[PDB]
Design a protein around this ligand. Structure first.
Ligand SMILES: [Ca+2]
Ligand SMILES: [Ca+2]
Ligand SMILES: [Zn+2]
Ligand SMILES: [Zn+2]
Lengths: 153, 153
């Protein structure tokens, strides 16, 4: 039963706190929390490879992709491990995040502890945009906030 | 071979970047970087158990102590895993950190990835203060800046 947590911050209004819980080894990870300061609608939501915030959100590298796959949605067979799809901000600009994923883990090879969680300007198009950026990252625009994923109590 | 990185930030002027490098598993970890905005003199420098920054540096818990020992200096056998002693700020407030430690690790059970690095207001008394706080935290005063230790390239 591991827990993790992440504080999302950036150079703008976007901030949040995201919790991670995995009841057993290689079981589903429940990810939930709250991000505010967002425009209403869909925002790309993913784990980047490195927990390096030295140059803001730009230093965290590619989507966490240890199996060298293409970008997709979380429900797609073809996806990066880091690919957590979208979160949805209500009219008030708050996304009440609640996701369950079995590809990410809080331990082992797919472990995301010490890596970067990031939220984006626009929707992750899940690889369906018909351009190169879609294929690579889902074309979700700017990084708005990020943080390193830490061990929680 | 493993690398890690930490951005230290707080509510005041204290900020820095600390790098970690372990050439071989369970071998010595090289820790180096720079911290600025500090008062001249010694400052406590340690790894706290949790990579939890939700309520600032207070939510990271006690010093990382998987072997259930008392607080010490890094050179002592009686020490917490997270006990990295003091760093030294010059007259300009800049601490050029360079530590080598073989008790902390970037893998296995003494692994510090996903935990919090913190720098303090005052010197760590290294367990020689003759009170209960001394053998708990080393009486290093307020936490001035912290960050979660992340995986680096
Ligand atoms: Ca799994
Ligand atoms: Ca060791
Ligand atoms: Zn991706
Ligand atoms: Zn200690």
């Amino acid at each position: 039963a591991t827990k993790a947590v992440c504080v999302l911050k950036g150079d703008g209004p976007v901030q949040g706190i995201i919790n991670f819980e995995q009841k057993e080894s290689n079981g589903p990870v429940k990810v939930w929390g709250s991000i505010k300061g967002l425009t209403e609608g869909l925002h790309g939501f993913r784990v980047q490879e490195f927990g390096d915030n030295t140059a803001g959100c730009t230093s965290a590298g590619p989507h966490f992709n240890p199996l060298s796959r293409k970008h997709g949605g979380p429900k797609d067979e073809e996806r990066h491990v880091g690919d957590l799809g979208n979160v949805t901000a209500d009219k008030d600009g708050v996304a009440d995040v609640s996701i369950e994923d079995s590809v990410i883990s809080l331990s082992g090879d797919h472990c995301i502890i010490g890596r970067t969680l990031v939220v984006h300007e626009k929707a992750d198009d899940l690889g369906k945009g018909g351009n190169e950026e879609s294929t690579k990252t889902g074309n979700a625009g700017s990084r708005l906030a990020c943080g390193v994923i830490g061990i929680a109590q």
